[PDB]
Symmetry: none
Subunit: 235 residues, 2 copies
């Protein structure tokens, strides 16, 4: 369905990048659970890509690159991605136990770091966290648009996908960040339907000027540690 | 039976608000049918309040405020309220004719509006709709709990009843909305027993942040128009 691919160069494209946080460590600890968990992740993300009439550009591992002709549809997809992953029955508590242990250890080396979820009573934790924790970044801007390579699909190049991917790279698992560009691409009425928290400006590697980031609040009362300025970014 | 009243402040309370949609217009058109129809409505709702061990906080007109120590019991009550009202013999088609006429007229002033039920063949319509159409909202949260006023009963104050009532106010007749808070108050096993449709987030008057709403699917294949952002809310 190339019909949903943004194709007009003069119309800004909204790009969404996603990743499972700590995917290396999770595959090392749970090699018999990750194939099925990641396959479920892809089925849920792809169901949403179709629901919101977005376009899958490409997937590498568990990393998705998704384009949308509509900034609000992209924001709705990211919000529903966090909510259906929370609602999904993963059939194991092992992935939640691993994330919690990682936070407790991380609190040894970061003295400014306090585990956001590891010490939550199970009744509090389950209403807020469950299963794979996916980080998401969203940016909107003009793109250099191309068709195929050989795939018969569309791709996007330049500063716009670079910023979207660098924005996602500093997000925590379970957190959705939007640049100010994406936030102000939404109409005023669209903004009344979402809940954001300003995070200020973040210097991103490769990007000249610091970027003002907004946290999209999806799962209510979910909180996070500081942004992960120490990264990994798409390709 | 104050025994069923939620009384522990540290335990979240599940509140259910209900209303007959278009009650003014129905009493104006059918003053000789409404007393008996509304009395039957109250008998059915009260039968369910007892069946599900919930607590009637108060009723004003045809509006019920019901509290439950159990989120799943409240959801079961709302589902059974829609089903027994559909099954009840109202002894008249006049109320169904009025709702259908209202939809047809409403389609003149809302060009984005299509009647959901007015043009259904009678065999389709009767399996889905019959009699008074009750809107329901459900939310779960910590409440400011008090005893009496003089009534020797318990009441609930604060943000929790405010959100439950504002949530009900935007529902259509025949529709049950739950906030995400209520949905995630249910256990995972409880969620497998119900069928919900995400409706995104809705900005509610008086409430700071938009609220993510879920439609509880009760009567199978029943569909609705957009949420009624133009309201009326409890008191």
């Amino acid at each position: 369905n190339n019909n949903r691919a943004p194709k007009e160069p003069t119309d800004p494209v909204t790009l969404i990048f996603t990743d499972i946080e700590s995917s290396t460590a999770l595959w090392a600890a749970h090699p018999d659970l990750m194939p099925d968990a990641v396959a479920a992740h892809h089925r849920m993300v792809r169901s949403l890509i179709g629901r919101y009439k977005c376009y899958e550009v490409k997937t590498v591992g568990d990393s998705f690159m998704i384009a949308s002709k509509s900034p609000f549809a992209a924001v709705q997809l990211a919000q529903e991605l966090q909510l259906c992953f929370l609602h999904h029955d993963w059939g194991t508590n092992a992935l939640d136990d691993s994330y919690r242990e990682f936070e407790e250890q991380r609190a040894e080396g970061e003295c400014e770091y306090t585990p956001p979820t590891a010490h939550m009573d199970p009744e509090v934790y389950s209403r807020l966290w469950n299963g794979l924790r996916v980080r998401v970044g969203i940016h909107t801007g003009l793109c250099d648009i191309r068709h195929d390579e050989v795939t018969k699909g569309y791709d996007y190049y330049g500063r716009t996908p670079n910023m979207a991917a660098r924005t996602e790279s500093v997000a925590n698992g379970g957190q959705v960040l939007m640049t100010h560009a994406a936030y102000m691409s939404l109409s005023a009425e669209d903004r009344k339907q979402i809940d954001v928290t300003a995070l200020g400006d973040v210097a991103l590697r490769g990007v000249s000027d610091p970027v003002k980031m907004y946290q999209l609040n999806t799962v209510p009362s979910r909180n996070f540690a500081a942004l992960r300025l120490d990264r990994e970014y798409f390709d």
